[PDB]
Amino acid sequence: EKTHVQLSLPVLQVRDVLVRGFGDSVEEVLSEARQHLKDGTCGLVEVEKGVLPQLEQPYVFIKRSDARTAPHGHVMVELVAELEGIQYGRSGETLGVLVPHVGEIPVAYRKVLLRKN
Ligand SMILES: Nc1nc(-c2ccc(O)cc2)cs1
């Protein structure tokens, strides 16, 4: 497994998302997020007012992991989970919140260089 992988994630509007989180514990949501990333079944919801209360906790965020540079168009990112106000991981700015993708029509694709850790 290389340390990072280039992915193009479908960006979903929150009201379209059918499965509003990955599971019921921090460890489960991180595990499931990683599996859906592997399978090409992970979407991204950009955070704006009203978005997080419409999604299910624990949340999985992708956050920016370096400023140096975004290789080949793909922002370098890592996963950080949140439950009841506590975060598991420390990283940079949030690009969005990951959710299962089950065929919803995206509004854009977001290119990222994902750290697998
Ligand atoms: N070849 C590819 N590997 C992945 C991947 C692999 C491992 C993870 O933990 C998360 C994503 C996505 S695409």
Numbering used by the authors: 10 to 126
Provide the authors' own sentences about this structure as they appear in the paper.
Non-structural protein 1 (nsp1), a unique viral and conserved leader protein, is a crucial virulence factor for causing host mRNA degradation, suppressing interferon (IFN) expression and host antiviral signalling pathways. SARS-CoV-2 nsp1 is a protein of 180 residues consisting of an N-terminal domain (residues 1 to 128), followed by a linker region (residues 129 to 148) and a smaller C-terminal domain (residues 149 to 180). Here, we report a variety of fragment hits against the N-terminal domain of SARS-CoV-2 nsp1 identified by fragment-based screening via X-ray crystallography. We identified two ligand-binding sites on nsp1, one deep and one shallow pocket, which are not conserved between the three medically relevant SARS, SARS-CoV-2 and MERS coronaviruses.
The majority of fragment hits, 3, bind to ligand binding site I, whereas 2 of the 5 hits bind to the shallower binding site II. Binding site I consists of strands β1 and β7 as well as residues of helix α1. 10B6 establishes various hydrophobic interactions with a range of residues of binding pocket I. The 2-amino group establishes a hydrogen bond interaction with a water molecule. Interestingly, fragment hits binding in the “deeper” binding site systematically show better Kd values than the two hits binding in the shallower site II which display weaker Kd values. With lower sequence identity between MERS and SARS-CoV-2 nsp1, only 10B6 showed moderate binding affinity to MERS nsp1. Among these, Lys125 is both an important contributor to the two types of interactions with RNA but also interacts with fragment hits in binding pocket I. In view of the close proximity and this shared key residue, we speculate that targeting binding pocket I could interfere with RNA binding to nsp1, and subsequently impact on viral RNA expression.
